[PDB]
Amino acid sequence: MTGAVCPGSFDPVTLGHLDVFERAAAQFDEVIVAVLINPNKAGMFTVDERIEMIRESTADLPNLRVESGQGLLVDFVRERGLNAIVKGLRTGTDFEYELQMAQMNKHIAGVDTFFVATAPAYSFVSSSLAKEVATYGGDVSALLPASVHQRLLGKLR
Amino acid sequence: MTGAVCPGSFDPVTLGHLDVFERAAAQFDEVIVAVLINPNKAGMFTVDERIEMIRESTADLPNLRVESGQGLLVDFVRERGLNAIVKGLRTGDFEYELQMAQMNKHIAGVDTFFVATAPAYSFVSSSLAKEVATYGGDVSALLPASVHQRLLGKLR
Amino acid sequence: MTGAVCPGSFDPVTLGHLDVFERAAAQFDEVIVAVLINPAGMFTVDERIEMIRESTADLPNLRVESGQGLLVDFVRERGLNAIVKGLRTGTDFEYELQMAQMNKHIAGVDTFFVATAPAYSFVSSSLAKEVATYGGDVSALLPASVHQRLLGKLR
Amino acid sequence: MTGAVCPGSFDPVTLGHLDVFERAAAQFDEVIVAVLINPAGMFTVDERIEMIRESTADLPNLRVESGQGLLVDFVRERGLNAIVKGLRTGTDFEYELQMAQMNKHIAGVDTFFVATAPAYSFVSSSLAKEVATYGGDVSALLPASVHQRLLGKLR
Amino acid sequence: MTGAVCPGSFDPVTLGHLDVFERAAAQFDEVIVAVLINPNKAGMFTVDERIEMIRESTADLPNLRVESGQGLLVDFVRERGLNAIVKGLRTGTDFEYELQMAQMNKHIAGVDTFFVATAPAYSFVSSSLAKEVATYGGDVSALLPASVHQRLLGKLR
Amino acid sequence: MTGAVCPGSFDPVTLGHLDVFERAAAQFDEVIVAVLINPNKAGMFTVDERIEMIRESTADLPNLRVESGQGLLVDFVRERGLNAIVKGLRTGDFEYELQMAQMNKHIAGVDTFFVATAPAYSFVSSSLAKEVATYGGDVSALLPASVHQRLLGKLR
Ligand SMILES: O=C(O)[C@@H](O)Cc1c[nH]c2ccccc12
Ligand SMILES: O=C(O)[C@@H](O)Cc1c[nH]c2ccccc12
Ligand SMILES: O=C(O)[C@H](O)Cc1c[nH]c2ccccc12
Ligand SMILES: O=C(O)[C@H](O)Cc1c[nH]c2ccccc12
Incomplete structure (x- = not known):
């Protein structure tokens, strides 16, 4: 009955x-x-x-x-018969560009966005920063699922 | 059966x-x-x-x-068999509210979902509406019709 | 003889x-x-x-x-020394703040910021272009003229 | 016939x-x-x-x-419809923002914000009073007149 | 030789x-x-x-x-022959009132302030919020040292 | 023996x-x-x-x-036997810098201490100074004397 979409590029999750x-x-x-x-990228x-x-x-x-x-x-x-987005947020700054997009999405399609504060322990990992740290050899094994970490190292090597 | 609690003082809604x-x-x-x-208050x-x-x-x-x-x-x-809070947000307070959400998750496993206010209602608050109305300002476009009626009675 | 300059790329306004x-x-x-x-x-x-x-x-x-x-x-070349800029968030205030202080320092030009009308809080030239490109209706966010012109650039 | 109002408690300016x-x-x-x-x-x-x-x-x-x-x-009683307010941070922008939008809504009065000079970024009436109360030198942060007046209220 | 002061009301730490x-x-x-x-309080x-x-x-x-x-x-x-303050910070908002005070303190006394990001796990505890939660019975045992938790509960009872 | 590293591109200082x-x-x-x-850049x-x-x-x-x-x-x-970074801050970026500091603490045990810029230098950055100078703006009060001399030579 109820439902939500969790979007992202997840490169990697x-x-x-x-x-x-x-x-x-x-x-x-x-x-x-x-x-x-x-x-295109x-x-x-x-x-x-x-x-x-x-x-x-x-x-x-x-x-x-x-x-x-x-x-x-x-x-x-909407094609899936839903009208909610759930997104994680780390900061007040995250709340501002995401705010803009949430209000645009409500305006054009009536879709609501619910934000949730990520857990403190994961508050500083992002896909981009994990990739950058791993590129130069830093240990990010505790910030990524087992399904990701060694596949990431493989991509980099 | 999903569910959420929307908390506040709502003085007035x-x-x-x-x-x-x-x-x-x-x-x-x-x-x-x-x-x-x-x-207290x-x-x-x-x-x-x-x-x-x-x-x-x-x-x-x-x-x-x-x-x-x-x-x-x-x-x-939790007494009502739920474990979600839904709260509205206007600005990045994403900060004091973030602290509270993480605290509430930590002590009781209750999650908090935030939603951005509609642009049109983004500057209204119970406290500011009361203050404006106290001095004869017109906040009728920012409150439900019945609230506005009741509010004028408390000021008289 | 007061005056101000409103700057931007306005692509589109x-x-x-x-x-x-x-x-x-x-x-x-x-x-x-x-x-x-x-x-x-x-x-x-x-x-x-x-x-x-x-x-x-x-x-x-x-x-x-x-x-x-x-x-x-x-x-300054137009005899003025005030800039008027619209602002949506506290984040915008901080990088615009740096520029405003730099502009005051190098040329004595003051910057006045004004908050967007609530109804346009979420519109920007880039987000409007992006949404329109993928078929979203932005007609309520742009001047009637601009909207028709945008459709013509995409189609 | 342009004009603006600069509001505050100014205790002291x-x-x-x-x-x-x-x-x-x-x-x-x-x-x-x-x-x-x-x-x-x-x-x-x-x-x-x-x-x-x-x-x-x-x-x-x-x-x-x-x-x-x-x-x-x-x-409005003075025939104007502009407020000019100084701002130091993005946090100030957000609660002043709420007020500015409310004031525009109820009375059509616009609010223009201007960034503090860098040198006064950290001075406020309350922090100046507090520091002076405990003996700190705030003479560079207040008009010469005000400073002498403040000393007199504390001593 | 080198030295710093860590200030607060610590009510409780x-x-x-x-x-x-x-x-x-x-x-x-x-x-x-x-x-x-x-x-006075x-x-x-x-x-x-x-x-x-x-x-x-x-x-x-x-x-x-x-x-x-x-x-x-x-x-x-300064009475201790030092001229550095070290303070913990959680948010961008913490950085703004604390910023004001740091620049005032440098102005009036030449004392520098160094800020450090608190650990993610403790980023949401404050003395005030711990007291408020404990007052109404919430479990804050993992956010306070052993030297504090039961003394706090004792104060409240 | 205490110590800290102050990192940057400093282009120019x-x-x-x-x-x-x-x-x-x-x-x-x-x-x-x-x-x-x-x-790269x-x-x-x-x-x-x-x-x-x-x-x-x-x-x-x-x-x-x-x-x-x-x-x-x-x-x-760590290669220099240290485990502290000192970085200057202008605004609340306390946010991207906070992320980086927590990441650096997590992966290597290195701490980061932030200090607020002097008010007078709070709006200068290497990038903005270069941009202003490129178009004939005067940034000599924001740079060390020798930098200003060298910068004018790169623009000619
Ligand atoms: O957003 C707010 O103001 C709420 O936290 C109020 C609130 C705090 N504790 C409660 C217990 C029962 C009902 C409402 C409350
Ligand atoms: O603030 C900044 O821009 C630094 O992180 C630069 C920086 C990143 N990695 C480094 C390795 C050696 C020397 C400087 C660096
Ligand atoms: O707000 C902006 O996007 C920029 O300030 C625009 C801008 C920078 N330099 C200029 C010179 C002439 C005319 C506009 C400009
Ligand atoms: O900025 C402030 O501190 C307040 O706006 C001051 C203020 C509120 N109402 C007023 C009416 C007359 C004159 C000043 C005021």
Whole structure:
């Protein structure tokens, strides 16, 4: 019945993302993780790799599924008969560009956005910073699921 | 059966609050609006008056109910078999509210979902509406119709 | 003989910008909208100027001009020393703050910031272009003229 | 016939306030400093007005008046519809933002914010009073007149 | 030789404070914890209680000592032949009022302020919020040192 | 023997940077200014030129030395037997810098101490000073005297 979409590029998914997935899956009947792909810029991981890494670390969430898309998020959401987005937030600054997008999305499509504070322990990991730290050899094994860490090191080598 | 609690003093409820209630009621199977009773600061409206104003404003939300509460919010939430709070936000306070959300998650496993106010209601607050009205300012576009009527009576 | 300059790329001008123009025009005798030439945008400078002129026809004390280089030189060369800029958030206040203090330091030009109308809090030229590109309806966020012009650039 | 109102409690007026007054006076034909009567402060309204008048003698187009109630009524009753307020941080921008939007909504009064001079970024009436109370030297942060007056209230 | 002062009301000290003490003690030759007392408002704990709770949870920091004071912090600092303050920070908002005070303190006394980000795990505890939560019965045992938690519950009962 | 590293690109060093260097040198037994070499973005001055400008500006700081570095900052710090970074801050970025500080603490046990810029230098940055100077703006009050001389030469 109820449902929410958790969007991102997830390149790769982090433990901060997984925390948000788990919290959304606990509060909505269904959750769709939307892996949003830019057709004009390849990330580090292909779409299939991104989805596989997410599925492997969400196997214990029976009401969660993972799908890719592109274009307007609100179309992805509405085409699935839903009208809620759930996004994780770390800071007041995150709240301002995300605020702009949430109000635009409500304006153009009537889709609501719910924000959740990520857990303190994952508050400083981002996909981008984990990739940058790993590139120059820093240890990020505690910030990423097992489904990700060594695949990341493999990409870098 | 999903559910969330929308907490506040609501003294009085504003259209900003109502917008949050509507969005919560659209996304959860049940919503409870929790009206704080505070033994120290007694504001402008009694708890009963505040509950009545909220019920009038939410008459079209069948899955939303209004109740008073006291003490620790997460106790109120867990006592009703729920473990989610929904709160409206205007600015990045994402900061004091963030502290509270992480504290509430830590002590009781209760999650908090924040939603941005509609742009049109982003500058209204109960306190500022009362202050403006006290001096003859017109805040009728920022409050439910019934609240505005009741507010003018308390000022006379 | 008061006056202020309202700067931007305006690619395209939005109703948020127009709101700021109207407020500046209501409080200063003379307003100049300063359109940056910075050549990777959607509209040419001439088109951007046209769209602003079209949308500001009811503001007799406002004119529109293009410029390059330091904004403070554009302002001072026209005998003014005030900039009027619209602001949506505290984050915008901090980087605009740095610029405002730099501009005051190097040229004695003051910067006045005004809050967006609540209804345009979330519109920007770039987000409007992005949403429209993927088929979203931004007609309520742009001057009627601009909206038709945008459709023409995408189709 | 342009004009703006600069509001505050000014208890006492600081060099940060004076900087904002001077900037408002340079860009508007008429400036009114609006001193709130809100009776728990250090100086009486008359003393606060005196200190501002003393510090603004070189600003011929500025006057100082006391008021109560809604600031927008003070502004409108004098035929104006602009407020000029100084800002130090993004945090100040957000609660002042709420007020500015409320004031625009209820009375059509616009609010222009200006960044403090860097040198007065950290001075406020309350922090100056607090520091002086415990013996700290705030003489570089207040008009010469005000500083002597403050010493007299503490001793 | 080198030295810093860690100020606060510490009513009571939290694990967030202790983290900051430990980090200052690791980077400066001596650290003084300055327990600042308002003679015009009693807190929950008396000065002696505050100091005892701090000493008991800093026994393994040999270069740290604890002293109370009042009035201007910069006088406390300079009277001890020091000119640095170390303070913990959680948010961008914390950085703004603290910024104002740091620049005032440099202006009036030449004293520098160094800020450190508290550990993620303690980022949401404050003395005030711990007291408020404990007052209404919430479990804050993991946010306070052993020297504090039951003494706090005792004050409340 | 206490110590800290002050990292940056310093392209060129500003009076804001120098103020941070001076405060660090006053509070730690040794300070190392770490000048980043970045293979991708080659800015206005070479690493050697940047080191020379910093050494000129810090001639009166005997316990401060200047070195170039590459890659992970915490490796640079630990390789020199230190575990503290000192960085200057202008605004609440306390946010991206906070993320980085917590990351650096997590991966290598290196702490970060932030200090507020002097009010007078709070709006200067290397990037904005270059941009202003490129168009004939006068930034001589915001840079060390020698930097200003060298900067005018690169623009000609
Ligand atoms: O947003 C707010 O103001 C709420 O936290 C009020 C609130 C705090 N504790 C409560 C217990 C029962 C009902 C409401 C409350
Ligand atoms: O503040 C900054 O820009 C620093 O992080 C630069 C920086 C990042 N990694 C480094 C390695 C060696 C020397 C400097 C660096
Ligand atoms: O706000 C902005 O986007 C920029 O200030 C625009 C700008 C910079 N320099 C200029 C010179 C002339 C005209 C406009 C400009
Ligand atoms: O900025 C402030 O401190 C307040 O806006 C001051 C203020 C509120 N209402 C007023 C009416 C008349 C004169 C000043 C005021």
